[PDB]
């Protein structure tokens, strides 16, 4: 990624060395090992002194313990289960946890289905014991490798619609994966069975246009007519916020607008007049 | 149709029936919709020619 | 991009602690550095047609293969020997980056990072811009410490080439 | 994952009834037509890197802004980056060629992949330049007869040349 | 700014007015007379 | 629409608070830098049409693939919508250099401008190129003595060339 | 949010033309006013506590029965005579942001766009705020000709509020 | 638009068949409560405005950052729009009252309203908690008797406490 | 992760040429004033924890609401999540005082941070009167002369009080 980077809040993680467990633990890595667990599988939530896990910790020193098998030790703690299961729908779970461990969202329906019958029938303190005892997990990460983000780089066996939804997981490096406006609901339940792919979005302040999230009702992907248009050359344009006069002039803001091509330049400034900005250009 | 065309019109040939399917659909605005009738020859040879 | 100011930035970050004095320290050897480093820049920036086309011949000279079979991949074409002063134009520029940026981080991306899967599919044996390098080590010109640290940058594309 | 053979069991499922004699006959062909399959893809991914540094020579060729300096195949790790999508087309492609439709190559390479180049900043239309100049290396690869014995393997050829025309339709 | 992006156009504020339509419409033999003379 | 006079306000309006003394003398500069706005300004868009023109030989100078058959500024209407857009460009800089702000730039010319480059298929990144192609010529225009008594004017040339530097790194 | 630089930006933008002769000279108006101004800037902002308790005194003087009647509407609590210095807390400070803007600007958009609908809810009666200013209008002790600049976007806000 | 008369309909169309008579029997509620529907929507709507304002120092009561210098419902046409919109809501609940199901508050008050306040900036989630400040209010209000005859309200009620509930979970 | 010395590169990389002598001795400058820079930031991190305790007591002096109860730094975890974020800035604001160049603070610091205070419910624009309340403050430090020899070290103080007012200014 260049240019993209920079943009989409990428560059941290793009040169990011993993932490590599060196068999003997000295002190000076251990410690910078438990930082970098709790950044990644609690996604940015701040640890307080309290909530340490400081039994957990000493176990992770000790030359036993994998790294693989001291982060299920956290995702069985009450920790792990206090900011998230507490608050989270089963769907909302599962791109959770596959975001916070494989480090990517589900690109299918498939696991979604077989991941609910196994947390029925068997538990969530196994359900945490699927995803760890996995061929997935032990191809990329060994036992004294840290999970990390694995949705940007090619990673044999992708879907390009796995791509678009991994920024539909964060909003970059600032974001606490509680931190998120759209809050107790899941995002990727609705894209996952309809199977169509929604937009990239920046992360902001880098990022002007931020305000569209995939709407409950949008306009379809690709449009069939000729869109009114002496040229067939349509164009589909994805709003922000639009601070119109009222009520009656904009009952809804962020929609999209399948326009062709010879009025496209139009209506750019007619967007720009109601301060509307705009997120993403298709063809169409 | 109404605006349009004044009621009597509808008729069944005046009607692209086309449009109002993508209208249901959503692809294109009401606004582009009257756009697509107002540019159609059944508006031009209805109001163009007599006018 | 590395560089040894931002090496002390994200080893702070990671760590999530200040700025102490041991990253200062860091920043602070880079200066020296730099100083010597940019001698070494102005040094080859003058000299930049000079070098580029004395290395192309020097390449041909050693190499007589690549002037006379047919083929896409070699020069026997004037658009190969076009696109001689493509590439060992482009490999200086990167060069005079990496002094000037004090580190080995643009000579990483822009040029390293790719190398190894470009020359396995289009036929660039690696062995010709290994020894452009190698006049390009010996004709530059420079005196002094200048002439080592632009000769430390030359022989650490040579190891990403071989 | 879907099938020829799958899709036939998908329709008849959603109808919930026993498949026809008229059905079944139509689906002999490809049990005989998969002698005719199963090479088509073979010619394909055996000059497989030659197709695709071939046609890395079509899209350079014709669009030298992509190595010209602030280009977006521009740099090294760019321009592998190229290479490592070059490719990853044609397997999703010879993936459909074995399966004889297209559901494959629509969940996994199709899927989506508009929304990145309106993300990264790489130009969608240029790569629907260069997929359909592979594909008149890739007929024309596949079409040619040395050794095995002459056949009318034209009109598996024609779905060859619609699977190409998908993906490089889907894509700007 | 009046009709918006997604709104039927209507006749605004005919409060005191004739309905457009009924008041507006699209639209804008010597031989005949003598030949019924002739009947 | 934005000023250098409504930021100071909606900056004390997020805090809520009268403003202070030691703000509006800093403020006060504006004023008498009025009158050193409001000619370089007139400066550049009485001279508006000779820098475009001059800068339409250097983009196109230096990639000549433009007006190469195939190119994407090739044909007439194409390159008469190059045109229509090297001094839409012009126009949003020289407002920005009289509101003092870039919030007008930001929200009519680099609002989701880019994103229009990977749709049609036009290079981002050369624009880019040919952008900070017309402020070395808006800066030589704007820095000549000749005419007006000699007066720092400068210091906020230092602004001009950070608002050509601003539109084209938010392009390419 | 509206401006006289502003005016000639948006006026020159939907004619599609550029900024002729006959927007600058918007723009130099506004810089021999905002002098001016700027001077009743800073009389405004040394009487802050000043002007709001003496307006806030002011309005109860002529209006004995907000100071009586129980409700929450009124000012008979200390959270009313609280939030009595809330509200002409913020009437001055945008009419110190009026007169730094040079236009009616901030003065449209933050006080006068809502207030008919407000005040129909809320019961508070704007013939309140209304004398409340015209206390503004006559103890702001300002002279010479920023005292008139002052004394204009204070009955613009009146004229909105009636 | 949809009723409790005709989801029976189209749940019967869906099936394509005659309506049962232990159907229309469990209907024949309906015509005897819509003697208790007809006026509980009419107590709601003759205090229509008694419950917006007196619920507009709810949420401003506990949240104190909402006519906070910088907060998002702090100025006079932002603070103007709370009540824009805070009996938005109760011309569609009343809807929903009379219509006896949410199919209309579904596709007018709830369809996508969520999606604008991750586009404005406004918290979704505090307008979820004066929602169900405002039924406590309206519960209270069309449960008390004064001059009318006593009847079985609180069956009824449930489902007016549920239409507020819905629509304070579907925002936040 | 960018410095002076590589947006310089970047810069000359798109446009793709040597740099010439004239571009170099405006880097000189900064081989000079590296003994300027290095010190500053290690005048701001002994300092460290008196600039944030101490303007604690600003915010929590201007506005009581943050300690009132139901305020939003009101309880223990919460206030410790104040101090978790108050000197969250000020490594990234010294990060980027040792680069030079305020894109790690981009990426890193303001990227996307505006985003959760609309969606947590903390006042965005409350943590902009604080951070310029820390400026005054760390300026204040950094500007005093006492032991270390005299030198022009207001030349980029003007860089440090611009990464605070672009912080600040990108928070609210
Ligand atoms: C006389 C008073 C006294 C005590 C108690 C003491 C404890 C002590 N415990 C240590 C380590 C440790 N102690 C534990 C203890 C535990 N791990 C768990 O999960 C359990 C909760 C718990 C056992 C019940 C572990 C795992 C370590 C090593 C951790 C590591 O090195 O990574 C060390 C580190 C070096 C060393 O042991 O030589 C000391 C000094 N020292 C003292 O002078
Ligand atoms: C804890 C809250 C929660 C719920 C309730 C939930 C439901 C849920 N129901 C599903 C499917 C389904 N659910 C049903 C249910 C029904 N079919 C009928 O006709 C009946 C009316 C009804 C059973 C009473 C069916 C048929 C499917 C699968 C449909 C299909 O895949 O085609 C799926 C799809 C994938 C999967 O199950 O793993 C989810 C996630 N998920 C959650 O997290
Ligand atoms: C016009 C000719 C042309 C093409 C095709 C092109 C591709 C191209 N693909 C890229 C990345 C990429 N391309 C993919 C593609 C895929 N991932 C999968 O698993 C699927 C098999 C496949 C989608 C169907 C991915 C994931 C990346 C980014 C990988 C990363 O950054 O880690 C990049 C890196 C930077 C950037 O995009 O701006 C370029 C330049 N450039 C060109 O000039
Ligand atoms: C029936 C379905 C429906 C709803 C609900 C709806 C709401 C709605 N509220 C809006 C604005 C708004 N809504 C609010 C509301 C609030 N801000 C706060 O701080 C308060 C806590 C809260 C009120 C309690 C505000 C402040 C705005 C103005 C935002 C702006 O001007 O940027 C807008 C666009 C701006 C406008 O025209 O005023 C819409 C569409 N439109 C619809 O069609
Ligand atoms: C198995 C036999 C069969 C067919 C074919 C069928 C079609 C059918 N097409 C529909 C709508 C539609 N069909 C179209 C089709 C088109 N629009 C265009 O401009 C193009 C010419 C064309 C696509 C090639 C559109 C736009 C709609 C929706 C129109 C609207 O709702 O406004 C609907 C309405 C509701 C629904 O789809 O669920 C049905 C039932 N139903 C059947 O049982
Ligand atoms: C999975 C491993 C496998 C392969 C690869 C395979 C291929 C294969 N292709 C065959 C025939 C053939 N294959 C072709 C193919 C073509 N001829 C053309 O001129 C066209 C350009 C081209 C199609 C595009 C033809 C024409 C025949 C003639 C015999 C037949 O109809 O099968 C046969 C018939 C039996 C034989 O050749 O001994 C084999 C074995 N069989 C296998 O078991
Ligand atoms: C595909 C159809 C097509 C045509 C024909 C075309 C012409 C065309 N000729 C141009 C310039 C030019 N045209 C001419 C041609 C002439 N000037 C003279 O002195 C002679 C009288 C005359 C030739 C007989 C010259 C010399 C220039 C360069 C002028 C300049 O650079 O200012 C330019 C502007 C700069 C450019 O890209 O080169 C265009 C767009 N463009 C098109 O897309
Ligand atoms: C006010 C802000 C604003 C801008 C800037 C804008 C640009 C804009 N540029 C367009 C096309 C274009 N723009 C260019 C520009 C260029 N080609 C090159 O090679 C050069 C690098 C460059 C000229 C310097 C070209 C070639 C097209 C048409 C491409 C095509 O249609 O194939 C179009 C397509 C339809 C139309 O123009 O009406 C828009 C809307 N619209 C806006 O609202
Ligand atoms: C070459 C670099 C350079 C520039 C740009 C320059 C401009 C310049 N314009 C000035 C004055 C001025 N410039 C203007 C210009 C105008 N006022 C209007 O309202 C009109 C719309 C507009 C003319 C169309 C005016 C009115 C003055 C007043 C002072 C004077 O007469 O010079 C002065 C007087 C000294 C000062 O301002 O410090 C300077 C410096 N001086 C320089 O050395
Ligand atoms: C930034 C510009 C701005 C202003 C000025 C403003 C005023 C304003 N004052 C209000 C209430 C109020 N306003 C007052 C003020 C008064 N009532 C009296 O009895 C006195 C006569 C008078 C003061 C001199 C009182 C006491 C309330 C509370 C009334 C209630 O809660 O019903 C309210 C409705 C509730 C609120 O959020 O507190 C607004 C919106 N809002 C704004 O956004
Ligand atoms: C506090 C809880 C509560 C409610 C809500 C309540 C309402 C209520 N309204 C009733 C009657 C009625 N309510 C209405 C009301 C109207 N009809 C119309 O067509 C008009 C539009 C509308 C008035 C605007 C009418 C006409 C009746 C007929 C019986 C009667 O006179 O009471 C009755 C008579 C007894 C019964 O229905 O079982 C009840 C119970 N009783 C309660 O205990
Ligand atoms: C809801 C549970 C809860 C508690 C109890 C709590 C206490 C608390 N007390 C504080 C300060 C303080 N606490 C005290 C109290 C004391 N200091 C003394 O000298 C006395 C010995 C002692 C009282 C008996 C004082 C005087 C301060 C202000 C100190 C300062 O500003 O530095 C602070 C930091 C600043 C603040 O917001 O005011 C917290 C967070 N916070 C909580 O969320
Ligand atoms: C180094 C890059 C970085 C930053 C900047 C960062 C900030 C940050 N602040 C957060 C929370 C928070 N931030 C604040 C800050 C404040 N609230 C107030 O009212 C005060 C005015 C102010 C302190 C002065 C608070 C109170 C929370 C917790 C909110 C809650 O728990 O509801 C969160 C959400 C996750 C969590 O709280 O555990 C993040 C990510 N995280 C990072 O990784
Ligand atoms: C109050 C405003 C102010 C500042 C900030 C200031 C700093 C300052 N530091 C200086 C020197 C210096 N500063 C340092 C500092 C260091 N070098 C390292 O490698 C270490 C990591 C680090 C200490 C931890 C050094 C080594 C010098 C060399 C010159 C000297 O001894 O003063 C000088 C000498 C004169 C000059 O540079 O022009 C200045 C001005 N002077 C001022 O008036």
Not at chain 1, 178 to 206: C, D, W, Y
Request: with cysteine; aromatic share 10%.
């Amino acid at each position: 990624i260049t240019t993209a980077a920079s943009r989409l809040g990428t560059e941290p993680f793009s040169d990011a060395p993993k932490v590599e467990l060196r068999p003997k633990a000295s002190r000076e890595e251990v410690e910078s090992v438990i930082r970098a667990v709790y950044r990644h599988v609690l996604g940015n939530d701040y640890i307080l002194a309290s909530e340490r896990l400081v039994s957990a910790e000493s176990l992770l020193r000790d030359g036993n313990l994998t790294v693989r098998e001291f982060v299920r030790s956290v995702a069985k703690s009450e920790l792990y289960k206090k900011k998230f299961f507490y608050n989270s729908f089963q769907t909302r779970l599962i791109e959770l946890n596959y975001k916070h461990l494989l480090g990517r969202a589900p690109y299918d329906e498939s696991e979604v289905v077989y991941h609910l019958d196994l947390y029925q029938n068997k538990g969530y303190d196994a359900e945490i014991d699927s995803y760890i005892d996995s061929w997935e997990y032990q191809s990329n990460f060994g036992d004294n490798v840290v999970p990390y983000y694995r949705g940007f780089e090619t990673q044999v066996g992708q879907k390009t619609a796995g791509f678009n939804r991994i920024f539909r997981l964060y909003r970059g490096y600032a974001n606490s994966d509680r931190a998120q406006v759209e809050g107790t609901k899941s995002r990727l339940a609705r894209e996952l069975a309809s199977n169509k792919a929604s937009t990239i979005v920046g992360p902001s302040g880098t990022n002007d246009s931020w305000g569209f999230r995939a709407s409950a009702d949008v306009a379809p992907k690709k449009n069939l007519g000729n869109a009114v248009g002496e040229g067939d050359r349509v164009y589909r344009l994805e709003v922000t916020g639009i601070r119109s006069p009222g009520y009656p002039s904009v009952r809804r803001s962020s929609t999209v607008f399948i326009v062709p091509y010879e009025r496209l330049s139009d209506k750019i400034q007619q967007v720009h007049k109601q301060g509307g900005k705009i997120v993403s250009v298709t063809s169409a | 149709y109404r605006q349009v065309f004044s009621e009597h019109e509808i008729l069944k040939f005046n009607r692209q029936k086309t449009l109002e399917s993508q209208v249901k659909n959503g692809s294109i605005s009401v606004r582009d919709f009257i756009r697509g009738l107002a540019k159609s020859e059944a508006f031009y040879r209805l109001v163009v020619s007599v006018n | 991009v590395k560089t040894p100011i931002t090496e002390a930035i994200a080893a702070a970050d990671t760590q999530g602690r200040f700025l102490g004095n041991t990253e200062l320290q860091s920043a602070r050897g880079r200066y020296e550095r730099a100083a010597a480093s940019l001698e070494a820049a102005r040094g080859l920036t003058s000299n930049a047609q000079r070098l580029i086309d004395g290395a192309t011949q020097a390449v041909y000279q050693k190499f007589p293969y690549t002037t006379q079979t047919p083929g896409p991949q070699f020069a026997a074409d004037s658009r190969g020997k076009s696109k001689c002063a493509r590439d060992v134009g482009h490999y200086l520029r990167i060069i005079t980056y990496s002094l000037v940026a004090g580190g080995t981080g643009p000579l990483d991306e822009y040029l390293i990072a790719g190398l190894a899967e470009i020359n396995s599919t289009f036929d660039l044996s690696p062995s010709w811009y290994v020894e452009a390098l190698k006049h390009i080590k010996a004709n530059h010109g420079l005196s002094g410490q200048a002439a080592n640290e632009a000769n430390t940058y030359i022989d650490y594309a040579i190891n990403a080439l071989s | 994952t879907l099938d020829v053979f799958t899709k036939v069991v998908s329709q008849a499922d959603s109808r919930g009834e026993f498949l026809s004699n008229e059905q079944l006959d139509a689906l002999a062909n490809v049990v005989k037509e998969g002698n005719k399959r199963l090479d088509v893809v073979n010619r394909i991914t055996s000059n497989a890197s030659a197709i695709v540094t071939n046609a890395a020579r079509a899209l350079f060729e014709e669009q030298p802004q992509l190595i010209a300096p602030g280009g977006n195949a521009y740099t090294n790790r760019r321009m592998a980056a190229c290479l490592r999508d070059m490719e990853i087309i044609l397997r999703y492609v010879t993936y459909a060629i074995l399966a004889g439709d297209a559901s494959v190559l629509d969940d996994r390479c199709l899927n989506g992949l508009r929304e990145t180049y309106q993300a990264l900043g790489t130009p969608g239309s240029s790569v629907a330049v260069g997929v359909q100049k592979m594909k008149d290396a890739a007929v024309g690869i596949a079409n040619d007869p040395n050794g095995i014995t002459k056949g009318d393997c034209s009109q598996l050829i024609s779905e060859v040349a619609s699977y190409f025309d998908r993906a490089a339709a889907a894509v700007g | 700014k009046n009709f918006g992006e997604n709104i039927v156009p209507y006749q605004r504020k005919r409060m005191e007015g004739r309905p457009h339509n009924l008041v507006t419409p699209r639209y804008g033999d010597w031989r005949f007379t003598l030949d019924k003379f002739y009947s």
